[PDB]
Nucleic acid binder design. Structure first.
Ligand SMILES: [Mn+2]
Ligand SMILES: [Mn+2]
Ligand code: NA
Ligand code: NA
Length: 327
DNA sequence: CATCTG
DNA sequence: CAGATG
């Protein structure tokens, strides 16, 4: 956690680099398990050889661990942090819509920068276009103080369209969190479930309302259950307009809301722990449901849930206010 | 995993 | 349809 800090970090830059710039999924993948095991490793790695001894640690990595330990640096890392082509790829990638792949295409055409991008708005696609337009806003975190206003808006319009909708804003926003990255809303309706063969209007209606009133500005992607958009809190009394924010809306069969809701509320760590305990208490948990564990090795059958309460109970545990769901 | 692009 | 992105 700090005993093998550099090592794990350098290794990460390496892995990261393989995948992003080059294509080296194997290699990239190699660096990964590698930092993971050393990450768990209980002592102070005093040398390459020492390391090698670990699984996932071959000669090539050991080689590296040496030079890094031998000198505060690594040539390879040094050579990579320089190289403009690498850098460009890490940058283009910041735009929502541009992945590695595309980063590579663009650079190999000379687009390496924002302007580059602007001058060639033709080559970019709609998502990427939005992305480029809101690059700035996009990186701006979302302060809880806005979160609450947003939340307030969304819940009110959903209510209006149908009293039966059930909306929930998950995310750390849900866990306390002073600011957040994007607005994550979980949605269901009674008339929508596991079996109940579809109902897309279910999602489409609300989507409309939000735009109706301008909360929603652009559509990144709009499927029948998931929607990736852009929204914005109305600018009050002109002098101060709000940054454009990322927002996601998702339909869920009522029969699996809370596991979902639980799940999205995180944190990853709280999930895991809960999940493990679930297992002890003879259970199974995932995104959508909780199941009774047979002894034959495994087994299923959807345990019925009516709240997040229902779940804990099942695994016979302490109801956790979302706040303390931290770890 | 759900959506898009081409 | 594969393949990319989130
Ligand atoms: Mn979030
Ligand atoms: Mn999001
Ligand atoms: Na080994
Ligand atoms: Na991106």
């Amino acid at each position: 956690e700090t005993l093998n800090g550099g090592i794990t970090d350098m290794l990460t830059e390496l892995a990261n680099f393989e995948k992003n710039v080059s294509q080296a999924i194997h290699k990239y993948n190699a660096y990964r398990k590698a930092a993971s095991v050393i990450a768990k490793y209980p002592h102070k790695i005093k040398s390459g050889a020492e390391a090698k001894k670990l699984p996932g640690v071959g000669t090539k990595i050991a080689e590296k661990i040496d030079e890094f330990l031998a000198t505060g640096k690594l040539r390879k890392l040094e050579k990579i942090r320089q190289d403009d082509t690498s850098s460009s790829i890490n940058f283009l990638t910041r735009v929502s819509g541009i992945g590695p792949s595309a980063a590579r295409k663009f650079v190999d055409e000379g687009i390496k920068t924002l302007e580059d991008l602007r001058k060639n708005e033709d080559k970019l696609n709609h998502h990427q276009r939005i992305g480029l337009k809101y690059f700035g806003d996009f990186e701006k975190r979302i302060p809880r103080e806005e979160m609450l206003q947003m939340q307030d808006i969304v819940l009110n319009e959903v209510k209006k369209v149908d009293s039966e909708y059930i909306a929930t804003v998950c995310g750390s926003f849900r866990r306390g969190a002073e600011s957040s990255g994007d607005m994550d809303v979980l949605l269901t309706h009674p008339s929508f479930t596991s079996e109940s063969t579809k109902q897309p209007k279910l999602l489409h209606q609300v989507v409309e309302q939000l735009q109706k009133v301008h909360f929603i500005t652009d559509t990144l992607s709009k499927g029948e259950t998931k929607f990736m958009g852009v929204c914005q809190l109305p600018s009050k009394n002109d002098e101060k307009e709000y940054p454009h924010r990322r927002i996601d809306i998702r339909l869920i069969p009522k029969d699996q809301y809370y596991c979902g809701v639980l799940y999205f509320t995180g944190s990853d760590i709280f999930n895991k722990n809960m999940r493990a305990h679930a297992l002890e208490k003879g259970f199974t948990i995932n995104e959508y449901t909780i199941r009774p564990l047979g002894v034959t090795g495994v087994a299923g059958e959807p345990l019925p849930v009516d709240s997040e309460k229902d779940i804990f109970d099942y695994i016979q545990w302490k109801y956790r206010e979302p706040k303390d769901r931290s770890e």
